[PDB]
């Protein structure tokens, strides 16, 4: 009852923190997608241009604490990247068939959660179409990672995780709960979801919960198996993360 009321307040904060973290990164493609020096680098991809966009993105990503920010031309090729001096530079890479690229071309913008193709680091890929004359010029992408939010949550003493509308856990204070589910999926649409996540190894098995008893709260009690130690008893509350289509759930130990 009052564990329930205290857990509601706690889950609401965690949701505002996450909202604040996302919104920091959102502003950068919002602004970059209309920038005449980004457009001109895509209308005339000379080596002087692209070096400046390279340093522009490099310095922007560093102060923004964005994993990568990069610019993709109309054929899917990354022409500029914040990580241009790193062995792991994205410059030259082909992302023509990436969701974040393809849906930004089609819709104007997209936000997509997936594992990095070489990094194996999960994150939100936030993308915007760069509009030109007579058509699209390319896409600007910022990848956000959530390691600092996940550490804040794990220090809270109340495990928390975020699901999409498919029920898949994307962000979690318990690492091995990532890509576990709130509902049984699986078998026929494991392939398409693993493809979507860029992660063949996504377990996509239900979260280790049982003895679920709903309350008139809208909250529920629950026995979970912890990444071992054993099983413990919890109160689960949920809340929407505002300005997202994401759902935060939080467990409080009984």
CB atoms within 10 A of CB 89: 16
Which has the closest alpha carbon to 235: 148, 151, 157, 152? 157
Which of 16, 75, 119, 245 touches a copy of itself by CB under 8 A? Answer: 16
CB atoms within 10 A of CB 46: 10
Q: Whose Cβ is closer to a copy of itself: residue 93's or residue 156's?
A: 156
Would you call 64 exposed, middle or buried from its count of C-beta atoms within 10 A (0-12, 13-18, 19+)?
A: middle
Which of 48, 77, 113, 152 touches a copy of itself by CB under 8 A? Answer: 152
Which of 3, 43, 60, 190 touches a copy of itself by CB under 8 A? Answer: 60
Binding to a copy of itself by residue 244, rule CB under 8 A? Answer: no
Q: What is the C-alpha end-to-end distance of the chain, expressed in Å?
A: 12
Binding to a copy of itself by residue 37, rule CB under 8 A? Answer: yes
Place of tokens 């509009």: 131
From Sr ion, a copy of itself, none, which one binds at residue 99 (CB under 5 to 8 Å depending on kind)?
A: Sr ion
Residue-wise DSSP of 76-92: SBEEEETTTTSTT--TT
Q: Return the axis-axis angle of helices 47-64 and 2-32, rounded to nearest 10°.
A: 160
Which of 4, 67, 156, 245 touches a copy of itself by CB under 8 A? Answer: 156
Q: Whose Cβ is closer to a copy of itself: residue 62's or residue 88's?
A: 62
Residue-wise DSSP of 35-54: -HHHHHHHHS--HHHHHHHH
Which of 217, 223, 244, 247 touches Sr ion by CB under 5 A? Answer: 244
Which of 106, 119, 157, 214 touches a copy of itself by CB under 8 A? Answer: 157
The last residues before gaps in the chain (C-N over 2.5 Å) are none
Size of the site for a copy of itself (CB under 8 A): 32
Binding to Sr ion by residue 93, rule CB under 5 A? Answer: no
Q: Whose Cβ is closer to a copy of itself: residue 17's or residue 185's?
A: 17
By CB under 5 A, name the binding residues for Sr ion.
99, 244-245
By CB under 8 A, name the binding residues for a copy of itself.
6, 9, 12-13, 16-17, 20-21, 23-28, 30-32, 34-38, 40, 56, 60, 63-65, 152, 155-157
């Amino acid at each position: 009852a009052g564990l329930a009321g205290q857990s509601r307040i706690d889950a609401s904060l965690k949701a505002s923190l996450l909202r604040a973290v996302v919104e920091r990164q959102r502003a950068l493609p919002l602004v970059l997608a209309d920038d005449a020096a980004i457009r001109g680098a895509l209308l005339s991809p000379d080596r002087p241009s692209l070096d400046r966009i390279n340093r522009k993105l490099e310095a922007l990503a560093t102060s923004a604490e964005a994993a990568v920010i990069y610019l993709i031309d109309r054929s899917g090729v990354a022409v500029a990247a914040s990580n241009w001096q790193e062995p792991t530079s994205f410059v030259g890479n082909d992302y023509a068939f990436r969701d974040y690229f393809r849906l930004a071309v089609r819709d104007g913008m997209a936000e997509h959660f997936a594992m990095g193709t070489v990094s194996k680091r999960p994150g939100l890929y936030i993308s915007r179409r760069v509009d030109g004359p007579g058509g699209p010029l390319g896409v600007i992408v910022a990848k956000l990672e959530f390691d600092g939010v996940e550490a804040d949550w794990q220090a809270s003493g109340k495990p928390a995780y975020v699901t999409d509308r498919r029920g898949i856990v994307l962000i979690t204070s318990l690492p091995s709960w990532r890509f576990m589910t709130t509902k049984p999926i699986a078998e026929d649409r494991l392939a398409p979801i693993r493809e979507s996540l860029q992660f063949g190894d996504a377990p996509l098995l239900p979260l280790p919960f049982r003895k679920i008893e709903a309350r008139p709260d809208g909250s529920s009690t629950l026995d979970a198996l912890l990444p071992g130690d054993s099983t413990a008893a919890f109160l689960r509350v949920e809340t929407m993360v505002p300005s997202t289509n994401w759902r935060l759930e939080q467990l409080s130990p009984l």
